RNA sequence: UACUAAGUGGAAAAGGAUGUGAAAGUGCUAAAACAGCAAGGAUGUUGGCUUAGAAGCAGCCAUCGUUUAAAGAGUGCGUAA
């Protein structure tokens, strides 16, 4: 199998969803509708075995450290915490917290906020 | 340590005679005598449906030997109870295997017929002309047989063509 | 292996042993296998 | 699940049922040749009722006493 | 030394005695994925799931108004499924964790102490 | 040579191409001793003449190989039966497809690319060129 | 009596040696740790920059959040990611 950091629209590139046992386009048509509500930054995608692969496909929450960079209005910051240049706003912070709450091993929103700030120190943003 | 461990004994299926020179495990597959040093100072306490062997003498050799012979007695008991089997996969397009009676023949790039010595006491089978199956009732003989088989043509470090143990991690160098 | 005069465990598997009274290092890293330590 | 059964042949009309089986099942000469030669042959397995009745109409338009079981 | 194990035996004994629904079961290992999933089901419920020392669980069930001398001291990964707050929520968590695995061997403990059933326990739990 | 086979031929002709090469020739000798051919349209043939070949030493279909040739004959007539469906009917009534019809159907299957015969031969003991040319003419 | 299995005696150097027995300080376990294994050993995360997706792991780092018995952007392997 293979987990990919796939796109939100087309999923054509990558020899990991094209041939794991399933045909590309007949799942791509599902990808355009199951992920059209999960667009934005590159969203994770996990493949599994139904028979070998045709169903049972769900998307994990987006890796919010480059979506967190986009919350800082950024694509490249640094490799370590640096001077403050962006700020994840109230609505963005709360929706990211509730977004990660189910992906994480955590139970509380405060653990989500600790999560978001914990990867926030790789580009140099403070998660409020 | 396995000195702390205990060996579950089968005193009715495999008679375990603790002759220090030749520990005799006698089961349905005959009787194999592990040749240990004559009159070992080590004591091999054989209880009923239980075994425990310790270092009666206190030395590095005896400290080695207690665990050595604990594992050895385990191997001997299970080998004379069911037997030991080793599978060798001669994965090659020009390398083949065969058995004539109890002679294991190899087919190399050689134009030379190849045979293979056995630490006898084992049966070697090649039903499909590519796999070698060694059955035996002594682990040392089986292992030496496998070593003597693999020293004919080990799989090439560059391509997996040779007599693997089916899990032999071949070192990979580059020449192309 | 190659003849040396001092064995150094430059690999984690470099077991300093004595085969036929020849002191060598046996290890997975065949590059580091030597002799006569 | 229902499977199509090409058991009978209206006036022994295996004539075209070879050809239709070949074109619709994507099988070689072997499969149709050895299957629709005999009555109890399992031409298809685990097919949905819609595709089963499509096979029904095809097999009867080329001529065969076909059953759905 | 063994004194440390002794007071922490006592601590887990109090922990098992105070709780009413404490249904601990070994099931051929408990996964960190399983712990994650079951604790998400327990979100906010400050109760924990773990596998811990056999002696301490032994005397915890022994001192938890039950018997655990060898019932929950053997068989590898002895999962500790205890509950906090509402007895209802405890029972629901126990039933959910039983349904988490393929077919779980009811090992030790019970809801409200002193087990009389093993199949009705899964029925009371749900 | 050391490493050749017949199953290798019919499997490589498929994994490389996949054209359903129907083996009308069964090589007597398949690894480093190819000196004979077992034919379906013709009879079995050996080759006593290494190097330069002039004679196709044909041999009949004996009791030890009647079933060996018969299984592949059924193999071939099960394809040939689909063409000229009167052959299919004949297979209902158990009549083996005539060799002339087999030859015409193989001619159609090579000029129409339906199925081709995969013959066998050698080039270092130089065996298997007689029936090669025979099938080429056929 | 403590030691040796090198005949060390009865040759030996820089250097190197998970050298033998014994012994001085440092821990748990005795309830059964530790070792191998039954096995859980996870999670954001393909975090980004370069490198194509090297992005658990061509390489760098903030490596912090969390479920916990345990966890590491992983001991690493496998890797196109």
Curated annotation (Swiss-Prot), chain B:
Domain of life: Bacteria
Pfam families: Ribosomal_L6
Keyword field contains RNA-binding: yes
SUPFAM superfamilies tied to this protein: Ribosomal protein L6
Cellular component terms per the entry's GO annotation: cytosolic large ribosomal subunit
Coiled-coil stretches: none
GO molecular function: rRNA binding; structural constituent of ribosome
GO BP of this protein: cytoplasmic translation
Gene3D superfamilies assigned to the protein according to its UniProt record, in alphabetical order: Ribosomal protein L6, alpha-beta domain (3.90.930.12)
Keywords for the protein's UniProt record, in alphabetical order: Ribonucleoprotein, Ribosomal protein, RNA-binding, rRNA-binding
Subunit structure: Part of the 50S ribosomal subunit.
Role according to the record: This protein binds to the 23S rRNA, and is important in its secondary structure. It is located near the subunit interface in the base of the L7/L12 stalk, and near the tRNA binding site of the peptidyltransferase center.
NCBIfam families with a match to the protein in the record: L6_bact
Membership in a protein family: Belongs to the universal ribosomal protein uL6 family.
Protein name: Large ribosomal subunit protein uL6
Organism: Mycoplasma pneumoniae (strain ATCC 29342 / M129 / Subtype 1)
From Swiss-Prot, chain C:
Biological process according to GO: translation
InterPro entries tied to this protein: Ribosomal_bL36 (IPR000473), Ribosomal_bL36_sp (IPR035977)
UniProt keyword Ribosomal protein, yes or no: yes
Superkingdom of origin organism: Bacteria
Key words of the record: Ribonucleoprotein, Ribosomal protein
Keyword Ribosomal protein: yes
Gene Ontology terms: cellular component: cytoplasm; ribonucleoprotein complex; ribosome
SUPFAM superfamilies tied to this protein: Ribosomal protein L36
PROSITE patterns: RIBOSOMAL_L36
One MF term in the entry's GO annotations: structural constituent of ribosome
PANTHER family, per the entry: 50S RIBOSOMAL PROTEIN L36, CHLOROPLASTIC, LARGE RIBOSOMAL SUBUNIT PROTEIN BL36C
Family classification: Belongs to the bacterial ribosomal protein bL36 family.
Protein name: Large ribosomal subunit protein bL36
Species the sequence originates in: Mycoplasma pneumoniae (strain ATCC 29342 / M129 / Subtype 1) (Mycoplasmoides pneumoniae)
From Swiss-Prot, chain D:
Family statement: Belongs to the bacterial ribosomal protein bL12 family.
Keywords: Ribonucleoprotein, Ribosomal protein
UniProt name for this protein: Large ribosomal subunit protein bL12
Annotated gene: rplL
GO molecular function, one term: mRNA binding
Keyword Ribosomal protein: yes
GO BP annotation list: translation
Full-protein residues shown: 54 to 122 of 122
Quaternary structure note: Homodimer. Part of the ribosomal stalk of the 50S ribosomal subunit. Forms a multimeric L10(L12)X complex, where L10 forms an elongated spine to which 2 to 4 L12 dimers bind in a sequential fashion. Binds GTP-bound translation factors.
Reported function: Forms part of the ribosomal stalk which helps the ribosome interact with GTP-bound translation factors. Is thus essential for accurate translation.
Gene Ontology CC terms, in alphabetical order: cytosolic large ribosomal subunit
Curated annotation (Swiss-Prot), chain E:
Biological process, per Gene Ontology: translation
Gene Ontology CC terms: large ribosomal subunit
UniProt entry keywords in alphabetical sequence: Ribonucleoprotein, Ribosomal protein, RNA-binding, rRNA-binding
Lineage of the organism: Bacteria, Bacillati, Mycoplasmatota, Mycoplasmoidales, Mycoplasmoidaceae
One of the record's GO molecular function terms: large ribosomal subunit rRNA binding
Listed name of the protein: Large ribosomal subunit protein uL10
Function: Forms part of the ribosomal stalk, playing a central role in the interaction of the ribosome with GTP-bound translation factors.
Protein family (similarity comment): Belongs to the universal ribosomal protein uL10 family.
Residues of the full protein shown: 3 to 128 of 161
Assembly and oligomerization: Part of the ribosomal stalk of the 50S ribosomal subunit. The N-terminus interacts with L11 and the large rRNA to form the base of the stalk. The C-terminus forms an elongated spine to which L12 dimers bind in a sequential fashion forming a multimeric L10(L12)X complex.
